[PDB]
Nucleic acid binder design. Structure first.
Lengths: 131, 135
RNA sequence: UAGGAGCUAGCCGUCGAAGGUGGGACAAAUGAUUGGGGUGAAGUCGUAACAAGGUAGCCGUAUCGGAAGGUGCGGCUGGAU
RNA sequence: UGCAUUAGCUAGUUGGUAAGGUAACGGCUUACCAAGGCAACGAUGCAUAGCCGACCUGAGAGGGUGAUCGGCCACACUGGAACUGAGACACGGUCCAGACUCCUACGGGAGGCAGCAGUAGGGAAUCUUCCGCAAUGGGCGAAAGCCUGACGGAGCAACGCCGCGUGAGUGAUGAAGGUCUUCGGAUCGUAAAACUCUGUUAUUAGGGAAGAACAUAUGUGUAAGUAACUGUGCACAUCUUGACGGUACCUAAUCAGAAAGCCACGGCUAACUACGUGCCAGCAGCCGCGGUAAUACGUAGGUGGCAAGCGUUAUCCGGAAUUAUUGGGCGUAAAGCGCGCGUAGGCGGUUUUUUAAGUCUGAUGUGAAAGCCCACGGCUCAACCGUGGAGGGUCAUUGGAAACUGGAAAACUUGAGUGCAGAAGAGGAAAGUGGAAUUCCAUGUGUAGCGGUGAAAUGCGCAGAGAUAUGGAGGAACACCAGUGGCGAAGGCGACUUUCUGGUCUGUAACUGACGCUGAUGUGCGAAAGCGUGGGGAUCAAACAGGAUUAGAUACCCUGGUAGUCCACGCCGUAAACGAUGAGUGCUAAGUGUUAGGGGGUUUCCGCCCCUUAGUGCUGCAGCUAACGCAUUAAGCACUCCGCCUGG
RNA sequence: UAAGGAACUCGGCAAAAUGACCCCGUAACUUCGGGAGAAGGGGUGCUCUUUAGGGUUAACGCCCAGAAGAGCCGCAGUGAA
């Protein structure tokens, strides 16, 4: 009876990011795998990997860090929810950490990102201010 | 809360009970009702004139007066200054302004305005207490 | 002629504002006297509670005592042996 | 706009059926048909208030004012009815009715300041019983003319906005001078007498102005032209008048002329010192000063903040994320009913395909006047008025795109239910078996004490008081198995044997294909005591009693003893009903026992070690909070719903 | 019995006024029964239609009406008691 898929999936990442993990996964969909692709399209992790099982197979994460035993993923938060579906305008779209994060864009142009919608001139359903 | 039930019940703001409740009230003299027009000073007439002890351990006798305003509300109003023309029945003017360390009395008495003149022997507080500027 | 038709006029019944009371209802003001509360002075008496505060508390309840408190029955520790 | 401490609202109402009649519509009214229609999404009703633009401060999320200044609505002593008119149910029309006021020669006559001043009233207070229509603008008239109490001006007010002021190079840091002195002094103080000099304003005596240009007045004509020509629109160039106003302005003369006030000098906060003064006078934004040495009061010089204001009073906003969408908490601070169950509502697992509705974009129209982006123009600056796009980048007319939502068609099962194999019990309502005890009556028994006492006594004792046993009875429950045991949602559940069951849980997981959660309403339980009945007064025991103690009684001591007790028969609706933690789902260090089921290895003569489930417990990371303390039986990290809270 | 209406008187004593039937309505307070016929309002004759009641029903006709319309008369319609 969970309601936000893309948030509990996102906080499970931060659930093991705190204790310095290098390997986790998540279930799949039409979206959530391709959502996990846009993470490794920018390449914030080593590689997000293949979906295997019967229904919503585990697709890996492989958390990629810095050489000072650090972490790269500071801040992990979906902004929309069942009850509040939020949208963005392309003309006043901001920059996460003033140019040090990313903000993805979801519409029927394909689920795009901050660079992939600032020069696309569409907004959409924004999700993550991840820096 | 939820933004769902905030539609069901909005964030209603908080009220603020304002000080000096006798200065934001008029009187419909024709219909015995009350208006609310927030005067600076509503005039009145003295009924009793006396003094009062501060219950806080500062010790004095500060002079007060039982004044009835235009809208006939009886108050206890502090009479600032030293000497006065406030024996009884002086048709006076009354400000707000609470005197602390004195229970109940929270109104001043405008010196030198309506039927009193102000006090005489002041030379550092001359604009107040009814004293015209010398020479 | 002005008789019919009509009209002014005449009556005849439907609806009327206001009125008239009529009962109330509601609201406000006042009322010999009164009884709860607040402030001051605490004038006074007692010392209940805080020290296992000299005879641990606390709730629901019930009874007595002017009050403080007294007791009793279920429950709670937010208590010493 | 708000109130459910307004929930059931309407009955020509609710739909239709026919006549009206309106510029048109019909329940709009009238004869007909069914009770319908309206509703907790709060209809109904109450209370309050002209609306909007606009103002205003807010980072934005925006929302508070309406004197303003514009657009719309309503009103014209009150309440009705009509007329006329294109337009009225008519602010200086009519009639009716009412209430007030006025004149009278008493016969009847009249009037409606919320049109502009003025008067009274009330108020803290808010303009002259002002001028002129010159301009504009309107009315009927070709025009001229009248009406302008519209308007354009003057008055008056610092009430408020902008400039203007209250005017200078010198020369004693001491010329004459006191808020001090352990005075000698720097000093008010390059202040100043004693002078150079300028004339904002000001004094005051002479030019003077725009606006004040636009007509009709002043013929030739043209155009529709006309029988021809005034006429009318259209070129002159001839001439009209000006409240403000000779005010403003310009010249000169003029004296350095005639002008700033106010609160503290404590710490907030830059501006201090002496006289009284004795918690007095009094100050007082919070902390506070004064009791004979006050920097704080009150008295007086310096300065200071900044100028015609300064200060007080009251009123909206920021400061303030104490309403927390942005941007608040519910264990001990205020925030979970006592728990539920549950009606509505909200919000819901997983994976495919349709729309383009919601999303997000693109072609335009495109959003308001002083208010509002940017840059000029007009103002002596400026106060104060226009320009140019920007222009909407929000709304409409328009094209679309499907991951994600809305609807359309499917499945999977974790989640839940229906299966199967078993464990346990104090889980609720009914029938038995027996024990032990306080009370009684009797035997035996006996006679001086028995009971009760912190201290003794009341009492109960000569009837045998109790005693004492095979054995006689009653009231009521039933130590032992008894536990950080188990079951129940919670109040709770305890000798058991049985009846009817609830429900828990594990394991295999067979199946339906999420069948879920909150949970307003509603319904229950609801501990104890209290309102009462029948067993109750056996024991216990409020209330009452007795004895003394104790300095004090009947209190701490003690019993007797009433209902109430016990239970059944009716409830009331309350507890620290608290795990002081609402309920459902994901994820992050451990060890440690223990309750039930499944898993075994050795085996054990039923016991050792170990996997797992659901739990019962005890210690204990990261995270957490104000800390306590929590940390798999979270107050950690996320999601959904309800409810509650915002000083005492 | 004009006008007046308790001024009478120890005292509204006596008298006057109210009264039947039908229809509308009705308070405080309560032992929930009541109060209550509370108070307070309205109507009533005769003739004809009629659609129709009790139906006299056979049906309007046979009387009261179902009770609705339209009329007529008087100062007054349970016209007396």
């Amino acid at each position: 009876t969970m309601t936000d898929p893309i948030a509990d999936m996102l906080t499970r990442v931060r659930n093991a990011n705190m204790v310095r993990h290098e390997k986790l996964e998540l279930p799949a969909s039409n979206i959530k795998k391709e959502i996990a692709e846009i993470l490794k399209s920018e390449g914030f992790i080593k590689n997000v990997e293949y979906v295997e099982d019967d229904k919503q197979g585990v697709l890996r994460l492989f958390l990629k860090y810095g050489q000072n035993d650090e972490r790269v993923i500071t801040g992990l938060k979906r902004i929309s929810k069942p009850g509040l579906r939020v949208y963005a305008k392309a003309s006043e779209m901001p920059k996460v950490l003033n140019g040090l994060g990313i903000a993805l864009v979801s519409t029927s142009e394909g689920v795009i990102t901050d660079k992939e919608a600032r020069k696309r001139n569409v907004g959409g359903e924004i999700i993550a201010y991840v820096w | 809360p939820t933004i769902n039930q905030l539609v069901r019940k909005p964030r209603q703001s908080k009220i603020k009970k304002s000080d000096s409740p006798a200065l934001n009230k008029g009187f419909n003299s024709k219909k015995k009702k009350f208006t609310d027009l927030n005067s600076p000073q509503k005039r009145g007439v003295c009924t009793r004139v006396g003094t009062m002890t501060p219950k806080k351990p500062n010790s004095a006798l500060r002079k007060y007066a039982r004044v009835r305003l235009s809208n006939n509300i009886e108050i206890n109003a502090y009479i600032p200054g030293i000497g006065h023309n406030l024996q009884e029945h002086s048709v006076v003017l009354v400000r707000g302004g609470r005197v602390k360390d004195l229970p109940g009395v929270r109104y001043h008495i405008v010196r030198g305005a309506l039927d009193t003149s102000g006090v005489d022997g002041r030379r550092q507080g001359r604009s107040l207490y009814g004293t015209k500027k010398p020479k």
